[PDB]
Amino acid sequence: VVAGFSDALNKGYEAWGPLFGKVFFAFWVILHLYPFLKGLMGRQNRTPTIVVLWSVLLTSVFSLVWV
Q: Which residues lie near other proteins (CB under 8 A)?
A: 42-43, 46, 48-49, 53, 55-56, 59-60, 63-64, 67
Q: Residue 29 CB, nearest distance to other proteins (Å)?
A: 27
Q: Which is nearer to other proteins, 32 or 59 (CB)?
A: 59
Q: Which is nearer to other proteins, 31 or 65 (CB)?
A: 65
Complete DSSP assignment for 14-39: S--HHHHHHHHHHHHHHHHHHHHHHH
